[model samples]
Target: SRRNAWGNQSYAELISQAIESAPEKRLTLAQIYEWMVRTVPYFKDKGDSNSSAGWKNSIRHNLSLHSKFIKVHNEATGKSSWWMLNPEGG
Candidate 1:
């Protein structure tokens, strides 16, 4: 059975919601982490270095592995990227 940090919801579901919640429909990884903690009861106080590594890894893995997530480059500096949901891919 599929599981997530918060009960039955998959990480993808939570991630999608986090990005969608952003005003610009895109978020940095840090913002996504913040939203997960804020919106999910299970993620509260889980951002510490030790305990969070596994889940953080999972989040990063999902971001890289999933085609639904599109990396948006910063136009000016081109040194940073943001994650955005690809509606069609989702």
Candidate 2:
């Protein structure tokens, strides 16, 4: 609880930023996780499954539950589409 992951901002804020970090301005779940633990200093030592599971689940929920995030269909046959910040909300 002493971590300074996002201080005043919630995980939604963090997720959005992570999604926006790409040159394409969109990210998949794995990239978001990469940015979550790889980019955020707080997750540097806590990237293990035990720590990531909880925080990562919260991410999936926020992506599914948040209105400001949107998904675009990917041309690929399997897997997922690109997730980006809602333009109106961006």
Candidate 3:
């Protein structure tokens, strides 16, 4: 028999934990993405687009724990991912 060992918690709680553990300067939205990409290694931040593509299972496994700052950019004129004080439109 398989055991249900996974623990559960509220999203708010999780966010709180994330925020609390964040650095004193606070992580900008883009910084978070860059860090995530670097950390995951599978996801790539191509210059044209902040396209995060690679091994799905590995990406999915890593992504399950946190939320990401999603932004749409034009491939023709997309800028590099830069950390912002808050999520776009926040």
User: What C-alpha lDDT do the candidate models reach, one value each?
Assistant: 0.79, 0.76, 0.40
Error (Å) of candidate 2 at residue 80 is 2.1
**Model 1, 29-82: lDDT tens per residue?**
888777777887566666654787777788898999868898887885766688
Highest lDDT model number: 1
For model 1, the run of ten residues with the poorest summed lDDT: 41-50
Candidate 2, residues 1-90, lDDT tens digits: the string is 565635767878777677666677888878888877676777877765476677778778887896778778878964777788877756
Q: Rank the candidates by TM-score, best first.
A: 2, 1, 3
CA lDDT, candidate 2, residue 51? 66
**Model 2 spans > 4 angstroms off:** 1-6
Worst 10 residues of 2 by lDDT: 1-10
Show the colliding residue pairs in model 1: none
Instruction: Please list all clashing residue pairs in model 3, or write none if there are none.
Output: none
Q: What is the Cα-based lDDT of residue 88 in candidate 3?
A: 43
Question: Candidate 3 lDDT, tens digit per residue, 1-90?
Answer: 452333354333433344345665244344444554554343453534534443333433433444443334435465542222235422
Clashes of each: 0, 0, 0
